[PDB]
């Protein structure tokens, strides 16, 4: 459909230079994030449909949950080990479904039950690389002015309006969502 500012998206008031072409913001604590990415799979539909070589990012936010910032480091570990797809469902589950993730040791146990070697996790968790990823996330949440999640910003300049995409079903919504992004990408 026609894309116009204020309808399917809004302009960032202070854009971010040298940002990835797509930046996703989420929290493992957020029921809406679970709903958006694990059930409806809107970010995954989007990731599948963008042009080849599109620079993508997915950042965790500190500001939800008692272990927000510990969970942001967990997500950095997941990125560093490249096991996002394996642990992401378990981390959502452990936070929201079973509430079995009570402490940082529980985060560690979660990675290990998702097949990550304890020794790799221990090497990674306070590594320079994981430290850099944590900084990367935290700074992104500031520079993109992210106050709520799920959120997606394109070209460091356009903020998606999730309540501005219309669909007769969630399945269409994700396709519809993916449709809007690619239009903002060619822009």
């Amino acid at each position: 459909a026609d894309i116009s500012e204020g309808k399917q998206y809004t302009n960032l008031s202070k854009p971010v230079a040298g940002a990835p072409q797509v930046v996703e913001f989420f929290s493992f604590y957020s029921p809406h994030c679970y709903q958006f990415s694990e059930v409806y799979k809107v970010n995954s539909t989007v990731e599948k449909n963008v042009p080849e070589n599109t620079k993508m990012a997915r950042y965790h936010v500190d500001f939800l949950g008692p272990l927000g910032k510990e969970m942001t480091r967990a997500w950095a570990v997941a990125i560093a080990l490249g096991v996002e797809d394996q642990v992401s469902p378990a981390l959502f589950k452990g936070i929201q479904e079973t509430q079995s993730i009570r402490s940082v040791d529980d985060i560690r146990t979660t990675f290990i039950n998702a097949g990550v070697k304890a020794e790799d996790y221990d090497a990674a968790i306070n590594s320079f690389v994981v430290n850099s990823l944590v900084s990367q996330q935290q700074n992104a949440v500031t520079d993109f002015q992210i106050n709520g999640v799920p959120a997606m910003v394109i070209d460091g300049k356009y903020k998606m309006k999730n309540d501005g995409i219309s669909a007769k079903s969630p399945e269409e919504y994700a396709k519809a969502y993916s449709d809007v992004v690619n239009q903002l990408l060619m822009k």
Binding site: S27, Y29, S30, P31, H32, C33, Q35, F36, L64, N147, G148, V149, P150, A151, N162, D163, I165, Y173
Partner: peptide, 7 residues
């Protein structure tokens, strides 16, 4: 439910 987000 895309209407609202968690802040």
């Amino acid at each position: 439910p895309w209407a609202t987000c968690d802040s």
